[PDB]
């Protein structure tokens, strides 16, 4: 049912520095002018994150499952719409209920259901060269969604599918860990200029999402676009992404005047 | 319960094919099967064939393969049988029956109680 | 219109509130009752069309041919029914739904089966031939206004209960006064005024030196509201 | 399927009369053997119901029994309708094999 794609180069993955990113907000908690010890699971500063990247160029095309372990720092950098949904699961088939969020350029769909799901999933976009515009043409992600014990669906927005080349301009910082069955998601997104790895900086993520899935994830996959104008036909376009993993850690957090966590010290990354 | 009635009579020639389908009535339609039997000019009858909704596979007559089909739809509360293999002696009146069911506990009666009033055809 | 009899549908509610207290308290049902269960305190919903013998006779731990042949049942949660003549019952009679008269095997506990497969009731392989000492498993009942109490349909619902949240009860909010407050999970005492400060959306409680919890979110009209403490 | 013979094929007899009538299969089946009433281009009715009683509605008229595969039934006060052809036909199997048919013959 679905494609398996090739003109794909084969390459080693990138490595780049997480800074000071991969903070978020411990809790719902209001708290001001004050630095306040939190021993959650965090990206360590100055991690060695994994760079995945997708390009036209060698045609790269970055989408292998990756482990989850305690808990996933992604982010990703684009303009073009490439790097869409996530899948989340013990084994990523239907043997068990798997979880999958898909952003297919309509809405947001998330679901649970013993999921058969491509080794190569995709959300192809093809160029109607008639109406002179790109839009949502191929998916399948999955062969069956069997047993399906959760739906939930965003409403209707319009994604701009357009392909699109030079400096990203929006970096899409994401949190995703798993407490007790719950998925939770923290969230942030900034304006940025770059073909590189993440920017340097400080922000802290808001819990946005809180889903009651019961789903024990071992490993997950990240979900590209397949541009076209065969199984050769598959444009990678440009846009990239950075997967680091949380650990406990104690970090002292600032807040300022109005509750923002505007800093923070890890306090396992250097005597000082 | 479902008094079934038929097409009109066919006026063709043998080796043709006739077109026979029953309209329900009463009620109790998907359940026991729809059956045809056929009725000898002069006398005699046989059974044909039949077919309960509810199941969708039916059963038939060894004397009659090759000459009946026999289908029903409970979402259309119509009997259908098409006629084949059809030659001068199957000159006959074909008729619906319903094959109601009373069941005496353990014990059950399939009868053509309701019948249709049989469409004949005119090879000879 | 409610699933026929062999034509279940066990719908799963999960992920909302419910309301059972208002379900049970209608004056409209003409049965209810609970096993190891509340409605008061206010998941699974099968719900159905059976004639009035079945449903006395299909319930939690009630033995009977019937039961073990169309749904058994032992379970936690409440069976509730209300009379259904004057929607099923026609005139002619409604036939459209089966009762079993023969079968296999009996049903495990909370577990119910619609199949209309040919059984050869000990003795004859029917194999798609009429019913001679083997049987279509299934007959209908005409449900027809002009009927009694066991034979009028109902409409059933076997109410598994976990994953459905009750309603909150929620009072005024008063302010200015010494009040022993409960703001969705905190609790405490003090008196309550409003505050000057402004919390993130996603922020619903505010914390002191010593990390007591004072300041909330209102949860109906979210504004920060001050929470200092009693002489 | 179950071989039924019926016989008288011409009775002698008319309206108001006692007219008797039989039919025997070959397999011994009590209730399974039973009548139907003929007309062509008629709807039939069935008249005897497992052995017993009558599924026409008829008040009685007719009675019988079987012993073996041999049975019996006669109507103490013959009417028009049993100038139609009654067949007697054996449920139990398939194809559902019906006797030869008989009627009351007036000439
Ligand atoms: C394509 O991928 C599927 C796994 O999703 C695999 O079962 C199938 O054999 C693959 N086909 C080819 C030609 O590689
Ligand atoms: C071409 O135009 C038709 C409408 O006539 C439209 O449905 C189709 O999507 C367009 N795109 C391509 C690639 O042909
Ligand atoms: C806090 O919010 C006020 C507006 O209510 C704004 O003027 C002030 O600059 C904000 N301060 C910080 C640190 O965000």
Known sequence: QCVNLTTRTQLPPAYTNSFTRGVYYPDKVFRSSVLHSTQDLFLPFFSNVTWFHAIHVTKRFDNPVLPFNDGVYFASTEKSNIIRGWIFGTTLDSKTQSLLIVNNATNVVIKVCEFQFCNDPFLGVYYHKNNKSWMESEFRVYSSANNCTFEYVSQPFLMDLEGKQGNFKNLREFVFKNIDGYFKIYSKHTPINLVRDLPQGFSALEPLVDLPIGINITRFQTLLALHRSSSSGWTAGAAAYYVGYLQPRTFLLKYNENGTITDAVDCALDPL | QVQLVQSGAEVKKPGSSVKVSCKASGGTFSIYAITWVRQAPGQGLEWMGGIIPIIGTANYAQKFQGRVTITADKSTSTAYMELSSLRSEDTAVYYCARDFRYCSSTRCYFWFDPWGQGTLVTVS | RFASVYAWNRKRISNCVADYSVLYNSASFSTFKCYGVSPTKLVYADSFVIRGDEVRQIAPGQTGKIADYNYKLPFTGCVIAWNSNNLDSKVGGNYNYLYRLFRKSNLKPFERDISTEIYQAGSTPCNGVEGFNCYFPLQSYGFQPTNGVGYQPYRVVVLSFATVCGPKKSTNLVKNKCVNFNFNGLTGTGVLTESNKKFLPFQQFGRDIADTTDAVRDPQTLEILDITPCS | ?107
């Open chain 4, 1 to 107: 399927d179950i071989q039924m013979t019926q016989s008288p094929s011409s009775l002698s007899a008319s309206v108001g009369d006692r007219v008797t009538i039989t039919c025997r299969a070959s397999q011994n089946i009590s209730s399974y053997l039973n009548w139907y009433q003929q007309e062509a281009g008629k709807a039939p009715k069935l008249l005897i119901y497992a052995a017993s009683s009558l599924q026409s509605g008829v008040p009685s008229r007719f009675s019988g029994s079987g012993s073996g595969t041999d049975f019996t039934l006669t109507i103490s006060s013959l009417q028009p309708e049993d100038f139609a052809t009654y067949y007697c036909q054996q449920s139990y199997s398939t194809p559902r094999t019906f006797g030869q048919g008989t009627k009351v013959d007036i000439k």
